[model samples]
Target: RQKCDHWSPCPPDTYAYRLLSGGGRDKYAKICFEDEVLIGEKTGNVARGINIAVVNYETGKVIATKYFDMYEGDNSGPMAKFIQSTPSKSLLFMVTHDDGSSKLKAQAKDAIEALGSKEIKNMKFRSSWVFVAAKGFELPSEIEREKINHSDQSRNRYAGWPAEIQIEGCIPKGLRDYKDD
Candidate 1:
């Protein structure tokens, strides 16, 4: 065999296909639809439970020493601060029956830490859908975020956390590479 000096795509510029388009993400961009993580957060501790639970999946991680609740009163709370300062590649919004803000950002964080806990309000979250803020895109405006969160009539029982947990499983080739997990 001859000495073949081959090359390879550097770090961030690995590979991607349809839906995501192009061959890869920006070398420094923190976005990629190819392979990502989706974890479920429930409505724990929060009273009345505005929305049963919500889900967010993130890629291009950081050490992430802490979590934040958007409901805090501070003019520039940690959650808002992060949104204002940092540029996330994708911001996903997936929740169930969450008509309006009823103190989720906190309970959700708790459920996330516990991997999920008992149902709050005696009823389980019953709807699920996802919205994303593309990489390099600016965070949504306050009104826009609200509309994205509240507007979904299909919000009802099929939205709760399933014991099987689809995200952590294997890929079904027959299943399109891109579809809801």
Candidate 2:
């Protein structure tokens, strides 16, 4: 099979990834790893909120995928716990659909910040945000790890949302972590 869908193919010793935030109501956020769709419209796992996917860094396999609706219910607490519960040496791909920051809490923001997300705190209503983070290791400086597009009434592509954003890159395998047991 082909190695990638949107970006150039990655090398054999590295894992490929692509994360895109939703643009409008129907344009759902998506996460692709090693040519597999981990979270997206077709997967039936994505929803109108903050979507996340955990992948095993060593094996390039999906550990889990879930979405937390920050706009409804008291889900901030659960979202924070879910992100923190990811085991070591994992890759976290995060994106937003519809509205992710309307009900986002400090707990969820702090958890994402611990994973090296600098833009989590800047998300606004209907913001298009996507991020790639490593739990126990550092990604090479060359990789594109995160991106965000805030909703602006003057420039919004959707009714009240900004255009979608995306980031794609390769993660080298055989990398060691300082916290490895």
Candidate 3:
């Protein structure tokens, strides 16, 4: 699979393309039709199921990690409630991918850790949020699209973490090199 690092956020009131890699792969690609939004919060909750990496900014090494699972339930209520109820600060990095798998989670964690370690002393994360949508694939028949609508409902729920002072936005390096047909 192709990989990338730069992401263009979807436009307001529009849908962006989210890509999913084949069952087993090392990388993926995504594109957007709008300006992306990165929510940097002084305090909030860490999202569940989604992959999270705490990196040391100076050395670019991963220091901590986390991920999310589909078993959590519908995309809206749980995530929204958690974000509203949590007390810890966090960065939410959203991306569009074909499928949410263990491999993608690992890559995300690694990236976050590297960033955290490299910039620890300068850390100013209020809350960094990234929203990834699947590209070039139709919603599964067994799954209802509204059940996973990409709105505030599409947000990933995080809890109890230090808030980032400044949220950084970028597309994955791997995905930037991808060639979509």
Per-model clash counts, in order, read 2, 0, 77
Which residue pairs show backbone clashes in model 1?
Answer: 126-156, 126-157
- Cα lDDT for residue 48, candidate 3: 31
Model 3 misplaced stretches (Cα beyond 4 Å) = 1-48, 70-181
Q: Please, what are the lDDT tens digits per residue for candidate 1 over residues 53-84?
A: 12122333331212222233432234333333
Better of 1 and 3 by lDDT: 3
Clashes of 1: 2
TM-scores of all predicted structures: 0.27, 0.94, 0.22
Per-residue CA lDDT of model 2 for 36-63, tens digit only, reads 8899877888898999999989787789
Per-residue lDDT of model 3, residues 1-181, tens digit only: 2112224442243222222211112222121111221211111222333332332222323333333332344433333333333222222233222233222233333443332322212211222223332222222233111112121223423232221111113322232234779
- Give the poorly placed runs of model 2, Cα more than 4 Å off: 177-181
Ranking by TM-score: 2, 1, 3
User: Which candidate wins on TM-score?
Assistant: 2
lDDT of all predictions, in order shown? 0.24, 0.89, 0.27
Candidate 1, poorest ten consecutive residues by summed lDDT: 20-29
| Pairs with backbone N, CA or C atoms under 3 Å apart (clashes), candidate 2 | none
